[PDB]
């Protein structure tokens, strides 16, 4: 029927002066563009078909041709930057924005999907979509008393597209676009579908990634408790972006950080820190590191929640990248902690796993660890206990590792490791 045509046949049909022939030919193009094994996107582009498809977007009298073009353009825009750029150069942005208003939900949804792919290309197209005025009609599609009455695939596409309009960093989206979208995003974050929740968390994660002014506008909407609740979800696709967003927030001010603490976040961390998914452990440990970089009373909350043995555990055994984050969490904690906090850290068993790590071929971890040693010595000094500390480092084999590091081909390692022996060994 319209299955398996050549591109030259599709060209013949689209150039006929017959709307029905054009329709058949567009659907044929769509079915070519819908196969998983190498769809001939470049062949279609090379044939000159994009501008014709874009003009079919405007055929209100022909709803089926509007849909097949939408779908064909969707799949093209789904390709490389060059393929997406061809769609945009065809004038497809305003035309897809106009179709958001279609009375046909399947057509309106296809327009949403296409705009998602265009914004997903990066900063410039995201921003180009926003200048065309996509946001208002996108949001007007979600202006319903209850989200549950929308078709679910449709709601998912809206959510994902809005999330691509929040994404990317150099530059971040316009402040006023972010302000416009946030209220609706807060609503979607309370919706009960897992994909809608996952992609709402992704959007919040994009929006909390950067300067503290951007964190602020999110935290101000009061989403942190709902984030923390999602952080406890059983679905890994929801936990991953909820954790990234929580982690982005605690890179912010002490007050912003305190908000995730007040939300109950640290109660979820015994399991996040022992999560069998190695990426959740990494991210959770990085998160812990920025909380240990907080106030003393924030550090104290890490203590009260029983989290320091979990940090010992991760430093002891974890994929190397997680250990690296753990080393940071310790360096931070020892640099901002009370002496009593640091004594506590040592009582939990930090020394021996910290020393084992000095065998790592990774200049940066070594610096981070020597820094933590020095910080801990500085607390031992204040208590007349450096000798008691030197013995533990000695007994676990830490001196051999510090001694070996003097002749290290790195100016920072040599200085601080000779300095440690000078002062303590």
């Amino acid at each position: 029927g319209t299955v398996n045509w050549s591109v030259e046949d599709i060209v013949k049909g689209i150039n006929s002066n017959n709307l029905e022939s054009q329709l058949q030919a567009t659907q044929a193009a769509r079915k070519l563009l819908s196969r998983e094994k190498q769809p001939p996107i470049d062949n279609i582009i090379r044939a000159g078909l994009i501008p014709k498809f874009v003009s079919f977007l405007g055929k209100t009298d022909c709803s089926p041709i509007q849909f097949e073009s939408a779908w064909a353009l969707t799949n093209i825009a789904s390709g490389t930057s060059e393929q997406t750029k061809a769609v945009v150069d065809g004038g497809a942005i305003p035309a897809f924005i106009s179709l958001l208003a279609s009375p046909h939900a399947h057509i309106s949804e296809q327009a949403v999907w296409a705009l998602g792919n265009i914004a997903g290309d990066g900063s410039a197209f995201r921003d180009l979509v926003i200048k065309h005025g996509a946001i208002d009609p996108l949001l007007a599609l979600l202006a319903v008393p209850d989200l549950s009455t929308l078709a679910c695939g449709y709601l998912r596409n809206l959510t994902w597209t809005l999330s691509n309009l929040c994404r990317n960093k150099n530059p971040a989206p316009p402040l006023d676009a972010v302000e416009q979208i946030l209220p609706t995003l807060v609503r979607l974050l309370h919706h009960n579908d897992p994909e809608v929740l996952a992609d709402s968390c992704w959007a919040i994660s994009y929006l909390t990634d950067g300067p503290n002014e951007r964190i602020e506008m999110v935290v101000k909407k009061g989403v942190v408790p709902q984030l923390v609740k999602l952080l406890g979800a059983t679905e890994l696709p929801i936990v991953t972006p909820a954790l990234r967003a929580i982690g982005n927030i605690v890179t912010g001010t002490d007050e912003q950080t305190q908000k995730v603490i007040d939300a109950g976040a640290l109660a979820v961390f015994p399991s996040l820190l022992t999560n069998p998914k190695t990426n959740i452990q990494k991210e959770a440990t990085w998160t812990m590191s920025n909380i240990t970089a907080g106030r003393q009373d924030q550090i104290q909350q890490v203590v009260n929640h029983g989290l320091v043995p979990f940090l010992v555990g991760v430093l002891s055994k974890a994929d190397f990248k997680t250990q690296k984050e753990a080393a940071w969490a310790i360096t931070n904690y020892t640099s901002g902690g009370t002496v009593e906090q640091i004594v506590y850290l040592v009582h939990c068993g930090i020394i021996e796993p910290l020393m084992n790590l000095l065998s790592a071929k990774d200049t940066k971890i070594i610096q981070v660890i020597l820094d933590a040693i020095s910080n801990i010595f500085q607390a031992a000094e204040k208590l007349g206990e450096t000798e008691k500390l030197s013995i533990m480092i000695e007994e676990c084999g830490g001196l051999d590792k510090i001694e070996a590091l003097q002749r290290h081909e790195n100016e920072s390692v040599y200085k601080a490791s000779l300095n440690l022996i000078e002062k303590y060994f």
Binding site: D209, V250, T251, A293
Partner: peptide, 19 residues
Amino acid sequence: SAKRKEPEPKGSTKKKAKT
């Protein structure tokens, strides 16, 4: 500020073909 802000980029699907 001991805060470290620049995580490994991560997201949902960037682009998506229909079927």
